[PDB]
Amino acid sequence: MKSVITTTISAADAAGRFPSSSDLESVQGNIQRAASRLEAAEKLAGNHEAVVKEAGDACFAKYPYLKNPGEAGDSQEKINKCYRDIDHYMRLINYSLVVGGTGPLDEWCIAGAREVYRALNLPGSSYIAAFVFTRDRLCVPRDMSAQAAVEFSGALDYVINSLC
Amino acid sequence: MKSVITTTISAADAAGRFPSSSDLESVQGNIQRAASRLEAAEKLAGNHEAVVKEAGDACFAKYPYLKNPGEAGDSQEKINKCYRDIDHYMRLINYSLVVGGTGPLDEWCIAGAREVYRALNLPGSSYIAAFVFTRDRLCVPRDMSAQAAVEFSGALDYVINSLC
Amino acid sequence: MKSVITTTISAADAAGRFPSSSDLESVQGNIQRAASRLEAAEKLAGNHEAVVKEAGDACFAKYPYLKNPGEAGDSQEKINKCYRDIDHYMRLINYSLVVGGTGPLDEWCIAGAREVYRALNLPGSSYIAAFVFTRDRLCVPRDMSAQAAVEFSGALDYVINSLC
Amino acid sequence: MKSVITTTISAADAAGRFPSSSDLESVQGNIQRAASRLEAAEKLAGNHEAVVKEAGDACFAKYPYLKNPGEAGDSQEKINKCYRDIDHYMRLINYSLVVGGTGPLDEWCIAGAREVYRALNLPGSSYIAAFVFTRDRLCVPRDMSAQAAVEFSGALDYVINSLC
Amino acid sequence: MLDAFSRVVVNSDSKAAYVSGSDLQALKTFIADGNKRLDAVNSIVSNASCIVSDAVSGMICENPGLIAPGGNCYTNRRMAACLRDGEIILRYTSYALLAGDSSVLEDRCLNGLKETYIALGVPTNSTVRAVSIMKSSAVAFISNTASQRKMATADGDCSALSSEVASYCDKVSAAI
Amino acid sequence: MLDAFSRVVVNSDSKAAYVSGSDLQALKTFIADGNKRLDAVNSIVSNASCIVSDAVSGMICENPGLIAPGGNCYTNRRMAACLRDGEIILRYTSYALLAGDSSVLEDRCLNGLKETYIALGVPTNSTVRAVSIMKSSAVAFISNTASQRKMATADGDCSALSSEVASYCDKVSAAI
Amino acid sequence: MLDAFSRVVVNSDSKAAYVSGSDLQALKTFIADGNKRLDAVNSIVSNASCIVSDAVSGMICENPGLIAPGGNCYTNRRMAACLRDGEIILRYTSYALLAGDSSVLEDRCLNGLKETYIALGVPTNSTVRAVSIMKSSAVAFISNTASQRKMATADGDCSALSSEVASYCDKVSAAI
Amino acid sequence: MLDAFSRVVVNSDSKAAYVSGSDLQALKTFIADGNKRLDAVNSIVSNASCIVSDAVSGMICENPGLIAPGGNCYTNRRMAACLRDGEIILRYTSYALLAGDSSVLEDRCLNGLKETYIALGVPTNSTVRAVSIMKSSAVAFISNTASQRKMATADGDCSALSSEVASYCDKVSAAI
Numbered sequence A, B, C, D: 001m002k003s004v005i006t007t008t009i010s011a012a013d014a015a016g017r018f019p020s021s022s023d024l025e026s027v028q029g030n031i032q033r034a035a036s037r038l039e040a041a042e043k044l045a046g047n048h049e050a051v052v053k054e055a056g057d058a059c060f061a062k063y064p065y066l067k068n069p070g071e072a073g074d075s076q077e078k079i080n081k082c083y084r085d086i087d088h089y090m091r092l093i094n095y096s097l098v099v100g101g102t103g104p105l106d107e108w109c110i111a112g113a114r115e116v117y118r119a120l121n122l123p124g125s126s127y128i129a130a131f132v133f134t135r136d137r138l139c140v141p142r143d144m145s146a147q148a149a150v151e152f153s154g155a156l157d158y159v160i161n162s163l164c
Numbered sequence E, F, G, H: 001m002l003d004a005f006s007r008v009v010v011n012s013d014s015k016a017a018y019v020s021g022s023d024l025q026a027l028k029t030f031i032a033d034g035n036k037r038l039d040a041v042n043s044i045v046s047n048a049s050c051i052v053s054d055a056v057s058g059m060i061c062e063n064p065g066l067i068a069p070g071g072n073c074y075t076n077r078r079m080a081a082c083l084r085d086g087e088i089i090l091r092y093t094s095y096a097l098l099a100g101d102s103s104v105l106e107d108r109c110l111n112g113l114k115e116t117y118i119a120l121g122v123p124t125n126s127t128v129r130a131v132s133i134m135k136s137s138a139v140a141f142i143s144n145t146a147s148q149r150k151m152a153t154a155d156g157d158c159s160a161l162s163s164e165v166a167s168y169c170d171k172v173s174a175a176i
């Protein structure tokens, strides 16, 4: 679980050092930035039902062939799994904002997505279409503050970069 | 040189990752604290002659036995060298405040201090008493502001603990 | 270059042994099966033009969405590169039959195709539709003898397993 | 035990590979040669009493000095042990024909023979002289088929090269 | 690491006797039906990707609690390790089918597998369900029965080899 | 390897729920009281050299049997390893106090400590006496009630921080 | 390595002089525009995946001899390595932009690269072409002039940082 | 390494052409005469201990200075390493004879041998004499002209293999 605090602590532990002046300056960075970062976590938590439905709808419209037989999504049971997976991703992006780093994303989303999506054979380009639309629909400042939006675009751009 | 910037870059370099939000959060902490540290470095730079010259006097007042023949500081050339070392230590503390970490202290004065002083028969408590007296004069706010004094005293307590 | 001979020598060399009776038995297997696979290699060599061309339309027919702007194969140059890629794979399947092992496939095409296709945004299902069509289209005996088709479908199934 | 099957599988196991055309072609070599080897093993099994007695006598006729007191084979108990040790070697040659490799010979006699024969002071020339006599006496076709005798002389030449 | 031939000489060594003609009759039959044994090993490894996908996906379909939080196939990392374990178990079964003996499977893969799964918290009953689906999938491909994919081959009898595949899969389930 | 922020999402993940309002309200206090926490860490690491000396020397005076022949702190090598171990234990307490969670203390230090000490023969009653002295020294420095050394800081209340230091040391005593 | 602050100290050490007022004022400008520097860097990192594929595909199209048989980007093994190490060069450039000094780029990546590329037979003409495309892409992203990708950012100038990126990529091209 | 088959496809890859009818024909000769090629290697490996003993015996006898003090085969330790190198070279020739190409011999044994022998002081004048004696004896054993060891085999012409092994040992003398 990479974070500002744990990276600093693990660095000092490996060298066998007490938390020094440089170690406590890093934690001050979280204190200053926690204001905007915890504002974006609230909005996503308060509107995850509407955001997921909008993103998932655009994913299938961009690649309608996924509805065809033999592909990922040829039945109702398979489609409602696609929306569930997007809800998983939007949930762990919400965790990344609270925690303050790519910790939750790297361990529960990106750790083995390369092997799993190949074996079950669901294309990864369709996931990017879901998050690209969410990133482009983000509007400032009707949705969140100017600094909060930058943090939210920071988390989305990491998820997209994983599949690219 | 360990500091806020190198610690996170080294941590990110080992894992083979691009600088993420966790790394940019640490550098943001440096911006907040750089205001206070660079005031303490300016104050010390313009008054290093007075601090060093009084600090050495307190060391010799506490330990008159260094004047005896056969000991460190038994002649006039030796006594000057004692003040010269305290200037070196007060110079690296000025470097520590500018750099923002314990980098310059560790690799230029602390690394081999144990072997050098033992070989040359220089007691470690003579150098300790020099920094304790300097840390005792330090008062707020006549000398520096409230936050600058904390930053300066932090570097001095680091030096003493290595000689303890 | 995995092969019957190279694997036998590598196993014997690692143990520092002379070619023993078991090692010559391995080469004896190559002699018996050489006529079967070299028959398919002479057939594929004369029909690389006809096989590749038919497989190319089969890939695009199942996935017409590649013709749209913004995805792979959206221009005339990109579609031309699509057919060249199938020829490259069908050239090394011809090399695999002659060699007698998956050496040419593993080192040249399989190599690191996983990382390359992710960067250039080339879906792995597009290639599979080309090799699946060729593998099922093959029939006996107007194409080749029964034993030759065993070796030919053996190489096609291996390259498919690398893409899914 | 080293054989065509075990060496082929162990190479595939090391790389984490499924058995492929390279691996199945090696096993095909064992099928072709199993006809010739199995004739030799079935022939030696039914005539092991005559071979051992004839080979054992040739050892002592060439080196009569083994009879003298103080040497190996100076007593009746030690003399019968010599014929018993030749029986073991002819038994494991028979195993090496059935297995299809030098597995039993390396595992069960050649593994630590050199240290053992030095401690008990048993010349390696005496065992060499017994096998040389058997190897040269075997003749075709009155004893075995032309190809079966090739495999038999391959096993005798292997043990002979091990003792000198 | 023993094949079919090594098993014969290992048993006969324990009585210090040469391999008799009667014991050689088992090996001559093994060689005569060797090409049938190569019909089948080629069939399993050609469809290894599909077999493991059926096993793991079918295993979760019957036990939906594995993908719920706290389940042992919840995150992406746990799902990828489950698929990788299904491939290793199938890979070692196709080793024993090729060699004709279960020694390679028992000594390199199933040695200590039960203890490892206990420490990791892996469910033992669900691991049985995954392998039992793999056992039915592999046997269907051996006898050329799978409905969607049919491999062209000459007609023959498949009872001896298909029964052997079931025996190797049962050894995995019985050990864990 | 879990701080106070990551502990919140670990509890939420167990029920597959988004971070609720109540949890986010508790985290805002942590950020508000962040400067108070920073000060605490600073005070400990500045006086860490003499804290471990008061504890180890203080433990010896009340139990003089350790320096007697055959004791576990007899020679210089045993005495040196006693001071190093006392400083390592104090080192992880500062890690837990900085991170706000005790997982780093339990997972990297306290895991297997009891088993190690039993094998080496280190007395348990003496070890907890040294830690109980360290706990008193750490609390004195956090509340700025040290008799000899004072640090000038803005007036405030650290009953929450000093109590937090107490719980981390009580975990060390309970582990061994 | 050395950052912007540490470069000032190393220069003042060679003369055994304290950090003067003139040098300190230069650092104060670095800190004041420190928000721009992170604002620049985030733009490069967020598009790192598409920048590299811009370079490698662009270098091939103008020089088709790379993918011809016998070329150094012929197979998939060479093409993957071209993408892998080309991204490494971009990774170390963002370190130099973040740290504010080019020492990290020279010491850990650029040290001994030229002599290695000669041994492997990598053409120097084609390599510098790929790098020069990366510099043009990064600068256009830094100044926020990318044709198809916009990021919302407060109005201002970034000629200082765009000149910084251009010089760092020029160091790579000049070394090899 | 590369065998006879891989040499054909490597040359045909340099022009990106399918394996031609003429090159395919030359391969069928290699396969058709494959029984003799195995028939030849079996002769060399059965007398490897005898062959390497002639070479060192002959090499020392014509140059008596080697065993004299100051020579490079004086003590037992240098004498043993001489036999170990003689068998290693003869071992790699049999690898090349089995494979049908000299790629294995050059890449794993002949690469950098000349530099090593110069540093170790090994006289290259006597080394090539040792190889030339092995070359003569090995050719005799393939053509079954050995004076004392005769192996009953089917009659035929194998001058193609005799010329081949003489060419492989020629590469050994040329490399050193």
Ligand SMILES: C=CC1=C(C)[C@@H](Cc2[nH]c(/C=C3N=C(/C=C4/NC(=O)[C@H](C)[C@H]4CC)C(C)=C\3CCC(=O)O)c(CCC(=O)O)c2C)NC1=O
Residues within 6 Å of the ligand: B059, B066, B072, B073, B074, B078, B079, B081, B082, B083, B085, B088, B108, B109, B116, B120, B121, B122, B123, B126, B127
């Ligand atoms: C960056 C590293 C660095 C240091 C930290 C010092 C370290 C140092 N100081 C002295 C120099 C000296 N220092 C003293 C002074 C003293 N006499 C007393 O009354 C006291 C006990 C003691 C200081 C409190 C003496 C006596 C010498 C002369 C040689 C010696 O060390 O005994 C020397 C010997 C020669 C020299 O001058 O270089 C060294 C290596 N110098 C450096 O360049």
Ligand SMILES: C=CC1=C(C)[C@@H](Cc2[nH]c(/C=C3N=C(/C=C4/NC(=O)[C@H](C)[C@H]4CC)C(C)=C\3CCC(=O)O)c(CCC(=O)O)c2C)NC1=O
Residues within 6 Å of the ligand: C066, C072, C073, C074, C078, C079, C081, C082, C083, C085, C088, C089, C108, C109, C116, C120, C122, C123, C126, C127, G057, G060, G061, G067, G074, G075, G076, G079
């Ligand atoms: C030995 C290894 C080996 C291969 C297997 C190929 C792999 C490969 N193919 C392309 C080339 C390409 N391949 C295609 C073709 C496609 N258009 C579509 O509609 C499809 C979805 C997609 C694949 C089926 C495209 C779009 C490119 C251009 C990408 C580029 O130029 O970077 C390129 C880029 C180089 C270039 O041609 O400019 C490479 C490395 N080449 C080799 O020599």
Ligand SMILES: C=CC1=C(C)[C@@H](Cc2[nH]c(/C=C3N=C(/C=C4/NC(=O)[C@H](C)[C@H]4CC)C(C)=C\3CCC(=O)O)c(CCC(=O)O)c2C)NC1=O
Residues within 6 Å of the ligand: C150, D024, D025, D028, E034, E035, E036, E037, E038, E039, E040, E042, E142, E143, E144, E153, E154, E155, E156, E157, E158, E161
């Ligand atoms: C590595 C390469 C390799 C192979 C792929 C096999 C291929 C192979 N298998 C058999 C051997 C055989 N295969 C079958 C037919 C069968 N009926 C089925 O549907 C089953 C798959 C199978 C029984 C298990 C039988 C019973 C024979 C012998 C009789 C015959 O069919 O002619 C034969 C001899 C006769 C025949 O052509 O069938 C061959 C060439 N062996 C090899 O060397």
Ligand SMILES: C=CC1=C(C)[C@@H](Cc2[nH]c(/C=C3N=C(/C=C4\NC(=O)[C@H](C)[C@H]4CC)C(C)=C/3CCC(=O)O)c(CCC(=O)O)c2C)NC1=O
Residues within 6 Å of the ligand: C024, C025, C028, D033, D147, H033, H034, H035, H036, H038, H039, H040, H042, H043, H142, H143, H144, H152, H153, H154, H155, H156, H157, H158
């Ligand atoms: C398993 C490993 C393996 C071997 C060890 C040999 C075994 C072997 N030797 C020959 C038989 C042969 N014997 C030779 C060779 C020779 N020409 C002479 O005059 C010499 C006496 C002799 C030197 C050795 C020839 C020419 C053949 C091959 C048949 C041919 O090409 O005409 C044959 C073919 C016919 C037969 O079965 O007898 C085989 C299979 N090949 C193998 O597959």
Ligand SMILES: C=CC1=C(C)[C@@H](Cc2[nH]c(/C=C3N=C(/C=C4\NC(=O)[C@H](C)[C@H]4CC)C(C)=C\3CCC(=O)O)c(CCC(=O)O)c2C)NC1=O
Residues within 6 Å of the ligand: A066, A072, A073, A074, A077, A078, A079, A081, A082, A083, A085, A088, A089, A108, A109, A116, A120, A121, A122, A123, A126, A127, E060, E067, E074, E075, E076, E079
């Ligand atoms: C916490 C980690 C976590 C993730 C990050 C994802 C990752 C993930 N995806 C799937 C796998 C799946 N998810 C989908 C969804 C899809 N079908 C479609 O219509 C689309 C193309 C596609 C998504 C875009 C389906 C249907 C499966 C099962 C495979 C299948 O039936 O084809 C599975 C296996 C479980 C299952 O069978 O659903 C997992 C773990 N889910 C998680 O739990």
Ligand SMILES: C=CC1=C(C)[C@@H](Cc2[nH]c(/C=C3N=C(/C=C4\NC(=O)[C@H](C)[C@H]4CC)C(C)=C\3CCC(=O)O)c(CCC(=O)O)c2C)NC1=O
Residues within 6 Å of the ligand: D059, D066, D072, D073, D074, D078, D079, D081, D082, D083, D085, D088, D089, D108, D109, D116, D120, D121, D122, D123, D126, D127
């Ligand atoms: C794995 C298989 C296997 C072997 C290869 C032998 C190995 C072996 N050899 C000897 C040892 C022996 N071997 C011989 C035989 C000989 N008489 C002579 O005059 C010569 C030295 C030699 C002619 C060939 C004798 C005489 C002994 C007994 C000597 C002793 O025990 O001191 C012994 C000790 C005593 C014994 O049991 O014989 C053993 C264990 N036994 C095995 O189980």
Ligand SMILES: C=CC1=C(C)[C@@H](Cc2[nH]c(/C=C3N=C(/C=C4\NC(=O)[C@H](C)[C@H]4CC)C(C)=C\3CCC(=O)O)c(CCC(=O)O)c2C)NC1=O
Residues within 6 Å of the ligand: E066, E072, E073, E078, E079, E081, E082, E083, E085, E086, E088, E089, E108, E109, E110, E113, E116, E120, E121, E122, E123, E124, E126, E127, E130
């Ligand atoms: C010697 C041969 C050999 C094997 C057979 C395995 C042995 C093995 N099993 C596991 C351990 C594991 N095995 C699985 C797979 C499963 N998930 C479930 O819920 C199922 C019940 C179960 C089988 C279907 C998983 C996911 C773990 C780790 C448990 C976890 O992460 O929660 C691990 C630890 C690594 C890991 O997979 O995470 C290893 C090495 N690998 C080998 O090299």
Ligand SMILES: C=CC1=C(C)[C@@H](Cc2[nH]c(/C=C3N=C(/C=C4\NC(=O)[C@H](C)[C@H]4CC)C(C)=C\3CCC(=O)O)c(CCC(=O)O)c2C)NC1=O
Residues within 6 Å of the ligand: A024, A025, A028, B033, B146, B147, F032, F033, F034, F035, F036, F037, F038, F039, F040, F042, F142, F143, F144, F153, F154, F155, F156, F157, F158, F161
């Ligand atoms: C990176 C380094 C770094 C630090 C180490 C802290 C230092 C720090 N602490 C506080 C802030 C404060 N400091 C304290 C707390 C304390 N006062 C006491 O009597 C106790 C000894 C101590 C707690 C253990 C109080 C009461 C405040 C005021 C606000 C608050 O409650 O945190 C402030 C704000 C202004 C001030 O009061 O000085 C700062 C800068 N922050 C930093 O930037």
Ligand SMILES: C=CC1=C(C)[C@@H](Cc2[nH]c(/C=C3N=C(/C=C4\NC(=O)[C@H](C)[C@H]4CC)C(C)=C\3CCC(=O)O)c(CCC(=O)O)c2C)NC1=O
Residues within 6 Å of the ligand: A147, B024, B025, B028, G033, G034, G035, G036, G038, G039, G040, G041, G042, G043, G141, G142, G143, G144, G153, G154, G155, G156, G157, G158
């Ligand atoms: C945690 C990491 C971190 C970041 C990612 C940045 C985020 C950031 N950017 C700016 C804002 C700014 N930064 C820039 C730079 C730019 N203007 C342009 O024309 C370009 C498009 C762009 C560089 C790519 C400028 C000119 C400002 C305005 C104020 C300033 O100079 O800082 C500001 C200050 C005002 C504001 O909140 O908007 C901040 C905090 N800094 C951080 O602390």
Ligand SMILES: C=CC1=C(C)[C@@H](Cc2[nH]c(/C=C3N=C(/C=C4\NC(=O)[C@H](C)[C@H]4CC)C(C)=C\3CCC(=O)O)c(CCC(=O)O)c2C)NC1=O
Residues within 6 Å of the ligand: H066, H072, H073, H077, H078, H079, H081, H082, H084, H085, H086, H088, H089, H108, H109, H113, H116, H120, H122, H123, H124, H126, H127, H130
């Ligand atoms: C695969 C490649 C390969 C080889 C070909 C050799 C390469 C090699 N040659 C020597 C080095 C040597 N080379 C020889 C041999 C000779 N000296 C003479 O007097 C003769 C002219 C000549 C015999 C033809 C000797 C004797 C040594 C060792 C020198 C010594 O023992 O002091 C050594 C050092 C180790 C040693 O032999 O002690 C090595 C590794 N070994 C390998 O693994």
Ligand SMILES: CCC1=C(C)[C@@H](CC2=N/C(=C\c3[nH]c(C[C@@H]4NC(=O)C(C)=C4CC)c(C)c3CCC(=O)O)C(CCC(=O)O)=C2C)NC1=O
Residues within 6 Å of the ligand: E050, E053, E054, E055, E057, E058, E059, E061, E132, E133, E134, E135, E136, E137, E138, E140, E145, E146, E147, E148, E149
């Ligand atoms: C998607 C996973 C899945 C299932 C299916 C079931 C799980 C499942 N797999 C089965 C059934 C099953 N399914 C396949 C695969 C399938 N069949 C073919 O004829 C070919 C070639 C196929 C690829 C298209 C095979 C090979 C079997 C085993 C053969 C059998 O039916 O007994 C069976 C019956 C026997 C068994 O294997 O245990 C079950 C219970 N649930 C799921 O979620």
Ligand SMILES: CCC1=C(C)[C@@H](CC2=N/C(=C\c3[nH]c(C[C@@H]4NC(=O)C(C)=C4CC)c(C)c3CCC(=O)O)C(CCC(=O)O)=C2C)NC1=O
Residues within 6 Å of the ligand: F050, F051, F054, F055, F057, F058, F059, F060, F061, F062, F132, F133, F134, F136, F137, F140, F141, F145, F146, F147, F148, F149
């Ligand atoms: C006679 C030998 C000897 C000792 C030493 C003591 C050790 C000791 N000092 C303590 C604990 C302690 N130790 C210090 C540190 C120390 N005090 C200061 O005022 C400053 C600044 C210090 C620099 C050295 C402090 C500040 C405390 C907290 C005050 C207290 O509880 O006594 C405690 C309380 C811990 C406990 O009871 O569990 C004791 C008993 N015992 C012994 O047998």
Ligand SMILES: CCC1=C(C)[C@@H](CC2=N/C(=C\c3[nH]c(C[C@@H]4NC(=O)C(C)=C4CC)c(C)c3CCC(=O)O)C(CCC(=O)O)=C2C)NC1=O
Residues within 6 Å of the ligand: G050, G051, G053, G054, G055, G057, G058, G059, G061, G062, G132, G133, G134, G136, G137, G138, G140, G141, G145, G146, G147, G148, G149
């Ligand atoms: C067919 C093979 C091929 C290519 C690939 C291009 C490669 C290419 N495109 C460039 C130019 C270039 N390309 C990009 C990236 C790209 N453009 C954008 O504006 C956005 C948002 C992008 C996301 C994909 C940028 C940012 C630039 C810099 C200028 C620009 O903004 O366009 C440059 C740099 C200029 C130079 O160094 O000479 C070249 C040559 N040409 C080829 O032959």
Ligand SMILES: CCC1=C(C)[C@@H](CC2=N/C(=C\c3[nH]c(C[C@@H]4NC(=O)C(C)=C4CC)c(C)c3CCC(=O)O)C(CCC(=O)O)=C2C)NC1=O
Residues within 6 Å of the ligand: H050, H054, H055, H057, H058, H059, H061, H062, H132, H133, H134, H136, H137, H140, H141, H145, H146, H147, H148, H149, H150
């Ligand atoms: C006193 C030191 C000494 C020796 C010992 C030999 C060593 C020796 N043997 C040779 C090579 C050689 N070796 C054999 C094998 C031969 N046939 C058999 O059936 C068996 C078992 C054989 C072992 C003797 C043959 C047939 C030849 C070629 C003919 C020849 O001996 O010249 C050659 C000729 C190669 C050359 O000169 O380049 C030499 C020098 N001569 C010496 O100067």
